[PDB]
Design an enzyme around this catalytic site. Structure first.
Site, PDB file in Angstrom:
ATOM      1  N   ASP B  38       0.898  -1.222  -0.198  1.00 23.83           N
ATOM      2  CA  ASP B  38       0.018   0.022  -0.084  1.00 23.83           C
ATOM      3  C   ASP B  38       0.980   1.274  -0.005  1.00 23.83           C
ATOM      4  OD1 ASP B  38      -2.916   0.757   0.280  1.00 23.83           O
ATOM      5  OD2 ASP B  38      -2.034   2.164   1.503  1.00 23.83           O
ATOM      6  N   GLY B  95      -8.112   8.467  -8.753  1.00 26.72           N
ATOM      7  CA  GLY B  95      -8.669   9.502  -9.550  1.00 26.72           C
ATOM      8  C   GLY B  95     -10.152   9.690  -9.529  1.00 26.72           C
ATOM      9  N   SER B 142     -12.365   0.205 -13.630  1.00 26.78           N
ATOM     10  CA  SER B 142     -13.351   0.907 -13.013  1.00 26.78           C
ATOM     11  C   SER B 142     -14.607   0.766 -14.146  1.00 26.78           C
ATOM     12  CB  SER B 142     -13.106   2.124 -12.991  1.00 26.78           C
ATOM     13  OG  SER B 142     -14.278   3.107 -12.789  1.00 26.78           O
ATOM     14  N   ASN B 147     -18.099   3.186 -19.576  1.00 29.55           N
ATOM     15  CA  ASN B 147     -19.020   4.242 -19.636  1.00 29.55           C
ATOM     16  C   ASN B 147     -18.578   5.743 -19.958  1.00 29.55           C
ATOM     17  OD1 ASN B 147     -21.024   2.445 -18.576  1.00 29.55           O
ATOM     18  ND2 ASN B 147     -20.703   2.988 -16.574  1.00 29.55           N
ATOM     19  N   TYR B 155     -10.084  10.303 -15.976  1.00 28.99           N
ATOM     20  CA  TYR B 155     -10.287   8.820 -15.214  1.00 28.99           C
ATOM     21  C   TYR B 155     -10.865   7.860 -15.909  1.00 28.99           C
ATOM     22  CZ  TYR B 155     -11.716   5.744 -11.462  1.00 28.99           C
ATOM     23  OH  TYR B 155     -11.893   4.654 -10.672  1.00 28.99           O
ATOM     24  N   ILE B 188     -19.274  -0.181  -3.589  1.00 31.78           N
ATOM     25  CA  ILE B 188     -19.189  -0.890  -2.532  1.00 31.78           C
ATOM     26  C   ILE B 188     -19.524  -0.362  -1.194  1.00 31.78           C
ATOM     27  CG2 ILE B 188     -17.194  -1.955  -1.048  1.00 31.78           C
ATOM     28  CD1 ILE B 188     -18.488  -3.507  -3.962  1.00 31.78           C
ATOM     29  N   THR B 190     -18.751   0.942   2.381  1.00 34.16           N
ATOM     30  CA  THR B 190     -17.839   1.057   3.257  1.00 34.16           C
ATOM     31  C   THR B 190     -18.214   1.938   4.438  1.00 34.16           C
ATOM     32  OG1 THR B 190     -17.290   3.323   2.322  1.00 34.16           O
ATOM     33  CG2 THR B 190     -16.066   1.288   1.466  1.00 34.16           C
TER      34      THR B 190
END
Lengths: 249, 238
Positions: B38, B95, B142, B147, B155, B188, B190
């Site tokens: 990370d 991003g 992503s 899309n 992005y 998701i 969180t």
């Protein structure tokens, strides 16, 4: 007819030869004043001179589209010569097959040349197109942006980014009166070398080309004229593949 | 069952939280020794420590995936600790929405972070994967990659490049015994606004993504390569 470019001012990059040269000449015949750019200043000048001798308006400039100072100079030159910008054809680009283990400098260069250059030129041109009452951006991509093969890590991925950039920035600049589209050309016989295009490779390309002939630069220029004209006033975010019905590996 | 990762060594980047954390822990439970990385040293160490406490094999280290020396340190740490590399999960990225007129450094950074980093890590891992008899690369992309929306110039275009890179380098590394796939994850946990066009009517869990990641990195997917699998309940959120 809506297929004219009356009172347009078009910048066409990488246009000393091939598709770019055909687009520049076609756009001038359709009424546009044309700013021809190319890495070699002599080649851009030769195209602009031919346009002027045929009765059109054009100037030619050197431009390395990866150089910010060159990009800014081309924008300024178009405004200084013709007073506005309404069409931008991002035809400059390059690259090709490369090994998977290429140096990262090669991978990054594909993006600097094929993508960063035309994004920045689009940024620089868009405020001027809005001031002029609207405009059209056309990106010359590649069939590699949709197809999949070996040795395409940098070329295919950068051209895929050009395609998706086209679809997405259409949303950003549509409200400024600007359309954004792309053409993915098939294999072009114009300026192709006889030693690179000898009858066995030509036969192999035509085996998967339904219309039975390779393309001409003028085919791409005809599609470019359509997409940059009022005949395509409600077309944006599209990637038009011009490849005779098939693919040419 | 070929849905396990027996004797695997997996590098998982961006693994301090969320999808990356779930993939690391899931992969360890499935039998893999995991190199957790990370940008934050403490985040990677925390996940590796939690894996070890639950009975798995893991080490954690800092890795800025855009830094070549960090990338090489992760490869070396995997080989020094576990002796080989067979799985690479490229989950580091970032991003989001930005204006069309963004500074050029912002546009270029999207590609450095989302694409250049994982292509270079793929280059570094591939010869070790080949020597180990084969491997699997998984890129976490992503939904923006396929899309079209406003404020997606950097992005969306960089994630589309990730998708097409996946499709194409599958051709280059298949002969070395390496599969390459991607996952495009939905939103998701969180709400009713984000779910208005989600057929399954719920947000996703990090574990949903990790289950798909486990499948695609396991021998159960041994003949799957070049694919982008969208895990989003049937639709697009927000």
């Amino acid at each position: 007819s809506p297929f004219h470019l009356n009172d347009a001012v078009a910048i066409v990059t990488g246009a000393a030869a091939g598709i770019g040269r055909a687009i520049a000449g076609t756009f001038a015949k359709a009424g546009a004043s044309v700013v021809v750019t190319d890495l070699k200043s002599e080649g851009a000048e030769a195209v602009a001179a031919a346009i002027r001798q045929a009765g059109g308006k054009a100037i030619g400039l050197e431009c390395n589209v990866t150089d910010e100072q060159h990009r800014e100079a081309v924008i300024k030159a178009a405004l200084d010569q013709f007073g506005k910008i309404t069409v931008l054809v991002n035809n400059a680009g390059g690259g090709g097959p490369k090994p998977f283990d290429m140096p990262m400098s090669d991978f990054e260069w594909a993006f600097k040349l094929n993508l960063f250059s035309l994004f920045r030129l689009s940024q620089l041109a868009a405020p001027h197109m809005q001031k002029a009452g609207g405009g059209a951006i056309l990106n010359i991509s590649s069939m590699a942006g949709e197809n999949t093969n070996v040795r395409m890590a940098s070329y295919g991925s950068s051209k895929a980014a050009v395609n998706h950039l086209t679809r997405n920035i259409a949303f950003d600049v549509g409200p400024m009166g600007i359309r954004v589209n792309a053409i993915a050309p098939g294999a072009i016989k114009t300026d192709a070398l006889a030693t690179v295009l000898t009858p066995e490779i030509e036969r192999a390309m035509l085996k998967h080309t339904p219309l039975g002939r390779l393309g001409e630069a003028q085919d791409i220029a005809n599609a470019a004229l359509f997409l940059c004209s009022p005949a395509a006033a409600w077309i944006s975010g599209q990637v038009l593949t011009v490849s005779g019905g098939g693919v040419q590996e």
